[model samples]
Target: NTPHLTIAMITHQQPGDTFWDIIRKGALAAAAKDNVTLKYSNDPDSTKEAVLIQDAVNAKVDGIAVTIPDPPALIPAIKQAVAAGIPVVAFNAGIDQWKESGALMYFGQDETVAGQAAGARATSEGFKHVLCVLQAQGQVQLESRCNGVQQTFKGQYTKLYVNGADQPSVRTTIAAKLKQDPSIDLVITLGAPIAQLAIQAVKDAGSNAKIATFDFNTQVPAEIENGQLQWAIDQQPYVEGYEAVDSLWLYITNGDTIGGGEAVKTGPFFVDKSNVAAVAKFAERGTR
Candidate 1:
């Protein structure tokens, strides 16, 4: 018998962005392999993201895949979906609340722990003052990363938010902050694309700031190799996307689930000169 599954695939961002594109490719490929049908949706606004999940539930999807960038607002919707017998698998965000929200499994890294690792690494390298750049405010996923940095670092960790969708605005805000803060010697970007702009912002503002980022993309490897950005961490969104979908299929097919009732960790890896080449090759193609 063919294992039939339909995924309510959703993201908290646009369809064409490089990061989402990488996630999409992995989800799409898994669907193709399992012959699963995916109902795709996207919204940058957290308020709207909640609505998207309701729409997925209303559609009576057999399974769900979502990134709860905002955890509190979306819990009710996820609860409603699960009560209706639909299996929800979360990726990209919401590790803590997802378990309580009745989501079947979460496939992603512990963002705060990863951020703590970044902070510890920075401190180990003798960076005294660190600036953690969070492009979007009120996003728990992004905040957790910075908060972790703040918790673990021995020195000051200054946080600033910019309009993530607007590059010029992001650059301007970051540059302005850099100029105002002379104590900031290290900048921690939450994503690879945002890190790219952070680099330019530091240079434009005439700040001698070193940067480390939590996520990566096609543009990061070369920069890492040339030492433009200190380091970048990969959450392995592709594996999360693929596994989130296929893991559901294994349940539908053989009644297997990871640990019977637990979330799975895809990653939180630091990509530096040592192994950037292999990871970079994947990022070059898509979001790996």
Candidate 2:
């Protein structure tokens, strides 16, 4: 007999971000099939995220899954959950510190490798000067991605920080940066929302700079299809979300474990004009 369970997916996702929305979509889908009640909540505020995790622990859910972007801020709550004997799984952002937080397993992309891939691709495409935009400054994943780009990209590069919470400001800031420097030939966005704004920034600044990004949302494929953007490094966040929930279910039901004491990397796959069509349907359904 399948036991009814509740799983909390506490994340540090800012409001209006489509990337986290898709991740929740996948987790909800899995919860429906597995007879699990999903309690999903997010706040990019570190304090609020810690509070949310503690809330989940207090609720006494069967399992908990979390994204640990700020390990120092989040790890305490994760350790608390583990100490309470609640199984915890990490996903989407904290590959480096999941085990340290006492999570049973992890699922996500290797941000540094994905960043390097993005840089190598940009380099291969002959982009001489690149502007890497960091919407959420101080995020380890975001910083690592840009760092990887800087390492592999054999060209002049600049890092621009912007307020991602404000769409209008993000657009204006990126546009201003592009207009301020005509030599920047490519813009690398860390997420899809920023990628959209970067495209508009390029247009608003009357610049020919190409736009590439690390993550994707539903709107990304059309941009790629219409040639408004260059490409996206898909981290397969949907799969991570699904596996996070299902893995917990497996643990509770059959005492199964996965990853063999290592992080299970879900992606770093490329999506562009050549293969965008193949993923369009899934993207439209908010799974890709």
Candidate 3:
């Protein structure tokens, strides 16, 4: 007998590629395990994270699986879903308010702790001045990472955001920042795509910035191979996605929950040259 539940799985657009793919794969795995019928969709602008939740609400889904980057816009929709007796589970983002917003559970890393881990990795690599790039500025998640890095890192650090989202503009702008600031010795990119851009910009400007990218994707391996990228932090986004859905199932079937009253921690793993080889293999097929 099929123990079916309708799950509306949501994610961002603009191509996070590996990060989102892994998350979706994890969700799918869980769906298979629990006999869930998933309704997958994209909310790339992140503004739409809530909209999809509302759509799920309108569809009267058995449950919802979402990633909320910003809370104010989402809290109402999530509340509405819960008011209607539908369960919501968040992953990839949303830490501080996932529970308060009435979400039954969340699956993802504690951004500050994840950032501290990243910072420890950077400090171990011996970089003195770190330039943390906020590809998506004003995001609590991105800011929390820089804050985490700052808390543990003894070196000088500053946050910079590139506007316009144009690759050429992003490259040129970051390159200019490096050229103007010689003390900056390491580049910390919040996303994989932006990390790729920043690395190129740093090189084009002839700067000595050691690049360490956060999040995951296929672009990281070659960069790691050539010594252009120092390391990557994988939050195990796919696992987060999978677990979010599965947890809801457990709640319905057996009342199993992680953290009890707090949000669950998916991960924040450091993948440096020492272990990049193994990570690269898994990430290549977008399952990490």
Candidate 4:
């Protein structure tokens, strides 16, 4: 039954970020059901994330699920894993780079397409001045999201960079920006925590900017219900982890290859006031 199989899930996640928490939850659940041991480790720094990958390879893990936030910093170790004959599946980022990194498949949303969806919605809602906040400066997916927004949005667009690792700093910087610019009527966040902080920033600045984000956690729905946030683009992060681990299991056992050598897109589904009530409970359980 392959009960001794183990999977190592590596991610670039900072502390206090609930988005990664849900991904971890889904991976653990899949491991339990498959009777596979889950070895999970992460670091926001790419170098450290590579070290974790090497460690997993050294331990001869059955499979590995990693997020390549910075492919240049992480690809060598991923290739090393491939050389060691460890099966690899990439998730949550690096959809475009999975093939180059030698990963079997990818599990996550297409960031550029997802961002265009957000932009199209915002434009439809009559938002003229948009401020897209980029939390991490150089992440390919994050930059891609903003690029997609720029390609679609009709009105004036601006990018605000902040230290996303520090919540208070992000809140303060965004609040200051809002106070400085009254014409900014829309704020788009690249992550869930930044979306949460943006709401606080709007309150602190006394600005009327509507808030939307690319990801979600348990509290996002409540905010949507309270009208603090307009909506969120859900990438179904739980499914990302669940499918990654399950796919690895299927490959190792039945010699099955999912996706037919392509990425399996998990989302870009919008969770708004209309469906927030229905999704809140699942989000609370850390599965949405």
lDDT of each: 0.84, 0.90, 0.81, 0.90
lDDT of 2 at 40: 92
What TM-score number comes out for model 2?
Answer: 0.97
Give the candidate order by descending lDDT. Answer: 2, 4, 1, 3
Q: Over the stretch 107-184, how does candidate 2's per-residue lDDT look in tens digits?
A: 998889888888898999999999999988657788889998999999998999999899999999999999999999
For model 3, the superposed segments whose C-alpha errors exceed 4 Å read 15-18, 44-47, 163-165
Q: Model 4, residue 135: what's the lDDT?
A: 87
The digit string of per-residue lDDT tens for model 4 on 1-288 reads 446798999999887778888898788888888889998899998999999999999999999999988989999999999989999999988988989878998999999998888888899989999999998876888988999998888898999999987889999999999999999999999988899899999999999998988877778888899987889899988899898899999989888878888899998899888988888999877777
What TM-score should be assigned to candidate 3?
0.91
RMSD of each candidate relative to the true structure: 1.5, 1.1, 2.1, 1.2
Where in model 2 is the C-alpha error above 4 Å? none
CA displacement after TM-score superposition, residue 18 of candidate 2 (Å)? 1.5
Candidate 3 lDDT tens digits, 19-94: 5677778888989999888788886575677788888899988888777777776778888889998888877777
Residue pairs of candidate 1 with colliding backbone atoms? none
Candidate 4: pairs in clash: none
